Amino acid sequence: TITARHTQYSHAKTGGFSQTGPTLHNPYKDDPILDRTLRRLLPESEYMRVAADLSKFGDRITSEVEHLGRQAELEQPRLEHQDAWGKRVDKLIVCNEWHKLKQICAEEGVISIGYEDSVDPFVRRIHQVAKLFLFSPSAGLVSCPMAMTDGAVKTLTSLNLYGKHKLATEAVDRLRSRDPSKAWTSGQWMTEKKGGSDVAGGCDTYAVQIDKDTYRLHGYKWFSSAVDADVALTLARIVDSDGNALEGSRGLSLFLLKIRDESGNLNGIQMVRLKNKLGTKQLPTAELLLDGAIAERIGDQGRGVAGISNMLNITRIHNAVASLGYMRRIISLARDYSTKRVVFGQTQSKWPLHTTTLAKMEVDTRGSMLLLFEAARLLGLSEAGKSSDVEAMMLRLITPVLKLYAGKQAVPMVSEGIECFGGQGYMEDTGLPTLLRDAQVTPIWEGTTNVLSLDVLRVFSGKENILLAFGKRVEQLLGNTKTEDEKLKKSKEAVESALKQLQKLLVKASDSAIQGETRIDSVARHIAFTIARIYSGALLIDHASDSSVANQSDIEVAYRYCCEQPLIDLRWEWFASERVKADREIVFDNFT
Amino acid sequence: TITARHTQYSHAKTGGFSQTGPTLHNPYKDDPILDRTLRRLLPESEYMRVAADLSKFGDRITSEVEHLGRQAELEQPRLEHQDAWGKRVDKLIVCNEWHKLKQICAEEGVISIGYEDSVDPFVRRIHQVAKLFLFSPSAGLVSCPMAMTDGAVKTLTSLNLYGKHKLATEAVDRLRSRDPSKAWTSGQWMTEKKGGSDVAGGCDTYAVQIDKDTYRLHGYKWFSSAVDADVALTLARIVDSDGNALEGSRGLSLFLLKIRDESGNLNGIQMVRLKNKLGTKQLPTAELLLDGAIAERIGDQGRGVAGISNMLNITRIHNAVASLGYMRRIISLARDYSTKRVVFGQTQSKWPLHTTTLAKMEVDTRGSMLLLFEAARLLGLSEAGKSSDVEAMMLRLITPVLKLYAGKQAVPMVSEGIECFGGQGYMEDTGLPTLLRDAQVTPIWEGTTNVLSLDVLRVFSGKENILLAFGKRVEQLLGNTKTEDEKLKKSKEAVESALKQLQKLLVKASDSAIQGETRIDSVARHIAFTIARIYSGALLIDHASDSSVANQSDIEVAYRYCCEQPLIDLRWEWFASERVKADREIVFDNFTA
Amino acid sequence: TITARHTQYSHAKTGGFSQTGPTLHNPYKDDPILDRTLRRLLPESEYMRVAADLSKFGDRITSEVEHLGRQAELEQPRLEHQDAWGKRVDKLIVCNEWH
């Protein structure tokens, strides 16, 4: 008999402390302003229906969707070119959770709700955009195929193809389907190696006619996301009976195709590789080599850029939803964590420096959230056939302004947000860095900040009616100000003074006399930013001025937004042609 | 015989175009302001020696170091707890290129230059800081152990241990060695699960006396970077003969230890795991369980935090170097790409909106760069015993202001830079996203933005009149303004105005304290940023005013920095305690409690 | 207008041959001696019940189980000692197909 050795088997001791991490609360109920915004925008009976759907979905997010989106990051997509026996197969391997998320989008009507024929288009885009906002930061980038799917439905519908074109009619029905066994998603293959931003210049895919409006496509698609989708829209140059094609925009035609044939093989397509991306790693983005891909021409020949133009309001809107969802999500988690993390003897929530940093993030977020809902409201009105001329013009203006502004807010805000967790915010296993890496896609794809800033200029150039309409919309918003509150009065005076200074600069910039020494393109971003802030400020004031829903937070936020940061940051001397040569000397000093 | 089948074997055709990526040029030669700045700060003689070293190193960066740093990201460190036969070994597997980078740091005197006895201290810190600035964005995060190594040397020499204390003396000699076969690196183990910002409340490591000043450590280190290092400094609570210890800052003492013993075995340490990090993936960062780690107490008992202060400050300057390194790198790469990428029929570089966006990044980067070199200057003067009272105060003030400000500039600026490449900027296999992921460490470690803003306030709280001193420094810089250039006159009046307004605000805040309705802590970041911008502007003006080296871009940059952004953004009402209540109501609206 | 470039986009040609791999047949039906052996060992009555079960299972093997077993090799188990917040959890991660 021996001494027993049970004392020689002992788990490590590590002090017994471990920090509780942030909790994700139902994102409908927890959101500072979503429910109040919906209450103002929708009729009470619709509001009750919408809020009940959204609240229930918010519990699905916490109980199910968040975990699924996390798995889709943990088990990233792979591609196998060949099987084991020497046959080219292009096998895409995607986790089960990616598929489950797609199914959930169908069941929840993330597309459907936007087009439901029995609901007022006004109401349905507001409901839809709200639902998309709850989904996005938990979606594992299923948000991307939802965006392109909504885009596709919009494009095919606007081209008057429904009940006229067989493939387009099946696509619309299936893209809109709530049955997860039948529903489809769409991709959008526009970006090529020579350009993305510039498709008229960069697109080098050719379409050879097979029969009537059926063509075979030959080209190289440089970024093609959601290659597990069912159909795609793309652009190509039709080749004439002489073997020739046209350069530029008027050479481009729009096509619809199925990605895989009846037996699940790729339709004239090879996946050259999957991209290795900073973020959106959940999402399969491939390079595609098209060699004989069978596709149907849709819309008029030479008018493919106009054809895809139908989609820009709604794609721009989904991308802003995503920027805002990451901004809201980091704030939501950071404020929760602030109540559980003790530093210097009390929780972070109690240190005024901490709440000062978060309060400013909340102010800026709220602004752009209202801008988002203004865009949703305008889109719905346009789809109901109920827009005033001012509302139709604000739909064209707001979509690029919203996208670029929220896109440019997103990374610095998320970056600030992760720092609220200290070193933990930098740890991938927390899930927090995903928010930053994924938010960084938002100012880049579907147009960069600067490309969209130029689009804004184009919306209005030179024709002063867009700016006069913007002026009328702001005036409508400020007309409801509760000027008996000194903060809201000051806020309104600040918005008016910014809009007047904007209008004076743009009139002065358009003076025929000074075309030679003026470069409005140079200050495009400044111009777009100033629109965004004036518009968002006027919306915050209106919101705060509605006694039936506003609280004291709403007034203070309107005040801070309007009065504690510049609404306009734009000086006449920045328009000068000479300023450019000085910018170039700054940038290229000692360049080799 | 058959028809031959050569036509049936054929590579894919893919259109024939592909885009040329950006080129990294010699970063000393290609830098907009580094060489001009060294010409001004250094004596003419030292200038030549220093610039030849840096220029040569720049070719080493492009020819060798960059590729090495890239490799260290592609083959990240791994940890194996056990061998195959049931023995716990804690084997850290790091790529050959990580090791090669450390060797190059020794050979190149990235540490040594800062301490070389034959060279004037003011010169050598300028030289050292410039060299670190060239190294940092290609370093594969070898910059991190270089920071900690420099901080360790400073700490150990400041405590007057060199020539007295056995381990500290060996450590100093090895940490400074240019011999890659002998050189050492250090770590710094402060952060624990309960707190990193707050080590007084967070630290739960205990030190049990073995003999005289040698102790056994027992604790859990929650973040320990560069666990391939040879030594580390750490804090622990000394246990008295009754088995008790003191809570709070006053219970902490400083310790120096060897990470591995003479057999290469861990010294009472187990590596629990490696962190899985957003960036700095090149760097091995572990959690450490200390159970009987042998360590030597240094400095006075109870004054560990004060003892470790030189490490915090040196590492905070290195961290600013890294922030600025990422900012300059992205701008260098983006500007080169602009000459090669055609969009809408011409190169990005020809489009005014593209140059407006980059020009602003350049203006902001130059200001922080001059602040960095003013910190290097002030550090050198302090180490030479040549600091005026004002220069000593400005060293203590500038260190956290610089770190936190460049820190907070870095992610938005590198984000803007990656967008210049469009979708390609988001592709990991370009190397560009690394710059963003890595730059994101810089506002977090060695003190968050806010925590350092609070250190700025600790600076004002001792003390002597830090604000007066700051006003004196700014006026030195502004005297010799070339008021004869209209843009520089305007720039000067902008800085004076911002300084006068800050002084005024801070005077009101001291006056109102005892009422109990003022919370200067609430606005600590706004105060810190105003200091950064005032100081940076005045430096830019002084730089542009020097007609011996300044070019036209230097004047235009000073003007834009000073007159086209607010230098001060701070209002009296932000100090009020009633505003905190409003902040909470904004932040916690609908919070699920 | 330009010469079209469709001929410049073209999949690789690799000769046109590839070898067919082996086929897994119903392992009850395809086995050389299993069914003959069960016929001898089991009473005639039990034989029928047992062979129908096994034969049906054999089609389940070829249609379902084989692929599942293959997947369990392609996605091998993993162990995570700690969660992201310093708690020891010993989380075993096994593929859905194992379950």
Ligand SMILES: CCCCCCCCCCC(=O)SCCNC(=O)CCNC(=O)[C@H](O)C(C)(C)COP(=O)(O)OP(=O)(O)OC[C@H]1O[C@@H](n2cnc3c(N)ncnc32)[C@H](O)[C@@H]1OP(=O)(O)O
């Ligand atoms: C975060 C997760 C979920 C949220 C989002 C998920 C998104 C998935 C990401 C997939 C992609 O990145 S797909 C690749 C997208 N590619 C782009 O976005 C390219 C960006 N470039 C531009 O926007 C350019 O400015 C172009 C393409 C519009 C320039 O084209 P053109 O060179 O043909 O320029 P034009 O000005 O000639 O435009 C041609 C026509 O198109 C019209 N058009 C152009 N833009 C618009 C618009 N926004 N609205 C209405 N119409 C528009 C324009 O009015 C004009 O019509 P007409 O004047 O002939 O009637």
Ligand SMILES: CCCCCCCCCCC(=O)SCCNC(=O)CCNC(=O)[C@H](O)C(C)(C)COP(=O)(O)OP(=O)(O)OC[C@H]1O[C@@H](n2cnc3c(N)ncnc32)[C@H](O)[C@@H]1OP(=O)(O)O
């Ligand atoms: C990118 C490549 C570039 C390379 C950079 C690589 C970095 C490697 C990463 C490693 C880390 O993150 S290591 C852990 C970093 N941890 C921190 O930075 C700590 C953050 N927290 C603080 O700074 C806090 O303010 C405290 C820890 C220093 C709080 O300490 P206490 O609670 O003891 O606060 P006290 O104010 O009582 O400080 C105690 C004494 O220490 C003094 N002290 C505190 N801070 C300083 C300082 N910065 N300089 C001089 N003295 C200082 C203070 O004046 C005082 O002196 P006396 O009045 O007693 O004489």
Ligand SMILES: Cc1cc2nc3c(=O)[nH]c(=O)nc-3n(C[C@H](O)[C@H](O)[C@H](O)COP(=O)(O)OP(=O)(O)OC[C@H]3O[C@@H](n4cnc5c(N)ncnc54)[C@H](O)[C@@H]3O)c2cc1C
């Ligand atoms: C993760 C990911 C997935 C994607 N998936 C898809 C997809 O499924 N389908 C698809 O079609 N595309 C996709 N894209 C591509 C995306 O739409 C392009 O990256 C984007 O349109 C930018 O184009 P580019 O990459 O060609 O950038 P470029 O145009 O080469 O470079 C952009 C830079 O050039 C500047 N620039 C461009 N034009 C001008 C101008 N006129 N004036 C001043 N500056 C200008 C921009 O401002 C920016 O600084 C994806 C991209 C990413 C990152």
Ligand SMILES: Cc1cc2nc3c(=O)[nH]c(=O)nc-3n(C[C@H](O)[C@H](O)[C@H](O)COP(=O)(O)OP(=O)(O)OC[C@H]3O[C@@H](n4cnc5c(N)ncnc54)[C@H](O)[C@@H]3O)c2cc1C
């Ligand atoms: C890659 C990486 C490597 C690291 N390597 C090392 C290493 O080798 N050695 C080491 O010692 N440390 C290391 N760290 C840790 C680092 O120093 C800490 O993460 C950092 O100091 C923040 O402390 P924390 O993580 O405890 O965050 P916390 O202090 O828990 O939280 C930070 C947040 O709390 C706020 N906060 C804290 N105090 C206050 C206050 N008084 N008032 C208002 N707000 C406050 C901050 O502003 C920020 O918003 C590393 C970190 C990382 C990310």
